[PDB]
């Protein structure tokens, strides 16, 4: 029973980075060569595992976290990184095992007059713990005077829209990102990679 990797990578819509979508892959036989050999997925980078040995290993589960971010913000998707996305939207641990695949989706995620459907969090009371998700849209009190949860001066909505347009440099163009996180719990290894 082959895995849905192509169903995750070729999905028509990706989630906002603040609400990054996680899929569990288990009870399957995996094939990472198709992931590795496909041309457009150039931004390939794994930590604690090499792309060459992925077939030999087996894991209890494999998680696929998918989202859309800016091109220059892709560098923040790695162990030990800090920044907007690393702090408030999607944090990976320093001991992260599994890896991140990103590609430019300007052809399909960008829209003339801006794509405001992709949002990210830029204000939070504290950094995210690794693999934490925060979907709260409550108005963030940055000022001293509380504003009772309604937008106003010195209290804003914590989510910012990306506004992707077909133009702009590679840095500001949308990048669809998929993070394959491997897991071992001493349970039966339900995903092998022959």
């Amino acid at each position: 029973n082959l895995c849905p990797f192509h169903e995750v990578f070729n999905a028509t819509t990706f989630a906002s980075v603040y609400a990054w979508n996680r899929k569990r892959i288990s009870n399957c036989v995996a094939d990472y060569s198709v992931i590795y050999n496909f041309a457009p997925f150039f931004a390939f980078k794994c930590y604690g595992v090499s792309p060459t040995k992925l077939n030999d290993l087996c894991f209890t589960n494999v998680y696929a976290d998918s989202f859309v971010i800016r091109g220059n913000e892709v560098s923040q998707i790695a162990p030990g990184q800090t920044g907007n996305i690393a702090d408030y939207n999607y944090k990976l641990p320093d001991d992260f095992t599994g890896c991140v695949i990103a590609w430019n989706s300007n052809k399909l995620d960008s829209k003339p007059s801006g794509n405001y459907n992709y949002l990210y969090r830029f204000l939070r009371k504290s950094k995210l713990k690794p693999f934490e998700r925060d979907i709260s849209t409550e108005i963030y009190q940055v000022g001293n005077k509380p504003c009772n949860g309604v937008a106003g001066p010195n209290c804003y909505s914590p989510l910012q829209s990306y506004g992707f347009r077909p133009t702009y440099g590679v840095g500001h163009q949308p990048y669809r990102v998929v993070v394959l996180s491997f897991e071992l719990l001493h349970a039966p290894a339900t995903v092998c990679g022959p």
Partner: antibody
Amino acid sequence: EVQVVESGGGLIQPGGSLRLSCTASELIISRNYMSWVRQAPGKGLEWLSVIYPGGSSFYTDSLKGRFTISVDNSKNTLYLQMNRLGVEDTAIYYCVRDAPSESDWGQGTLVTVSS
Amino acid sequence: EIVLTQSPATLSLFPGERATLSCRASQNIGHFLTWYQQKPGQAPRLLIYDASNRATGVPARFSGSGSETEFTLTISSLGPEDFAVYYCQERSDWPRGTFGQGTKVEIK
């Protein structure tokens, strides 16, 4: 109107160190994007460093090692430790709060490095 | 590194005239650019953010336009108080970014 007040300027010898302080009244510095921007006399502005609401801090390449931004949550103030200052570090240092639609600057404090 | 070249270095106009100021970037920074007003001997003041949006409290005569590599700031009618130094700052890595050299406004 939002007011941010800087402090800790003045004279210092070359190669010395200084720590500027910045405080705000109507906002919480701990929960804001607070950046330090200097304006050399008769020269253009230069963004030096920022500290995020979560505590992440970033610096320009030319300043790496010599500057260290920080915050003390209890006092509601922002600090900029400055070390190994040269004659070119003389400038008026602004404590600026950044928001998506607002950018609130303080009046600044002159920092002079001379003998 | 992104370097912004503002032009003209000095813009000499009479009161009531329309002032058009240009900022040009070395790289495609999209719409991420900010315009700052600075009276002499005072801290800068936010005019335009995202290269087109007018900041709260700014009078309607100020407006921004342009994108990618060629940005422009327009004052529809110069009042006496509009005579100042205007800085363009790119915000590709907001709140980080480089500043332009600025453009003073003076006639007499």
